[PDB]
Amino acid sequence: KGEELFTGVVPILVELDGDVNGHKFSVSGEGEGDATYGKLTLKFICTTGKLPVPWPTLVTTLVQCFSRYPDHMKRHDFFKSAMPEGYVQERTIFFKDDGNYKTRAEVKFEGDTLVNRIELKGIDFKEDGNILGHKLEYNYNDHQVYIMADKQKNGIKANFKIRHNIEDGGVQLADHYQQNTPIGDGPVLLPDNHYLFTTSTLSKDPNEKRDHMVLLEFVTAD
């Protein structure tokens, strides 16, 4: 299917153009994903200077087509079946007591690479908030995601919460709203509702002088 394109190790390119309170920036990313394991290995550079926001606020925004699916729900795999043409992923991310992110992204094959391209627009942030002020720990608290089919739009929708640890205590709620629609016209499998479970570990490349983020991840559905 499109699922056939994920049977081996696939390389991933991630490119991000972003603007948060008029602070423009660019993130690029590359690595591999192996869906038989729901494994991702990826490194991100801010290619414009310093990242104007904490890295763990871009993890969600920076590939659910790599989740491992059981054989009994191979077919409820919308993400893989929209390949190679891909899908649009849109989100509104609400940071409690602060501004909000708006993102549009196209995940699609380009040659043999899985490409995730992102427009990120962020407005209304406080300049000494936990975000612009860089007051967030470099670690992640993942959260499951409930995938709901959207028959009208032919894709999926989901709303989940992510909790970011605040330096010195506390938690910064990030309210996620997400809809995906396919880009092609090729009949696409619409899933039954189901969960994506993710585990993310952030680290650093001791040799990398630019502002970066090393990301290892597993995601699996059930």
Nearest 10 degrees: CA dihedral of 73, 79, 83, 89?
170
Q: Give the helix ranges, DSSP H, for 94-219.
A: none
Instruction: Please return the burial class of 155, using the count of CB atoms within 10 Å of its CB with bins 0-12, 13-18 and 19+.
Output: buried
Q: For residue 163, which phi and psi values (nearest 5 degrees)?
A: -115, 120
Tell me the C-alpha distance between 3 and 34, whole Å. Answer: 12
The CA-atom distances, in angstroms, between 39 and each of 16, 81, 131 are 21, 19, 29
Beta-ladder partners of 68: 220
- Report whether 73 contacts 193 (CB < 8 A): no
DSSP 126: -
The tally of domains found in the chain comes to 1
Sequence letter at residue 108: K
Q: Which of 132, 121, 146 is nearest to 98 (CA)?
A: 132
- β-pair type (155-165, 171-182): antiparallel
**DSSP for 42-107, written as a single string:** EEEEETTSS-SS-GGGTTTT--GGG-B--GGGSTT-HHHHTTTT-EEEEEEEEETTS-EEEEEEEE
How far does CA 144 lie from the centroid of its chain?
13
- CATH code where residue 39 lies: 2.40.155.10
Asked if 132 and 111 count as a contact pair (C-beta separation under 8 A), the reply is no
Q: What is the resolution of this structure in A?
A: 2.7
Q: Which domain range does residue 209 map to?
A: 3-221
Sign of the CA dihedral 56, 62, 65, 68? negative
Burial 47-81 (b: 16+ CB within 10 A, else e): ebeebbbbbbbbbbbbbbbbbbbeeeeebbbbbbb
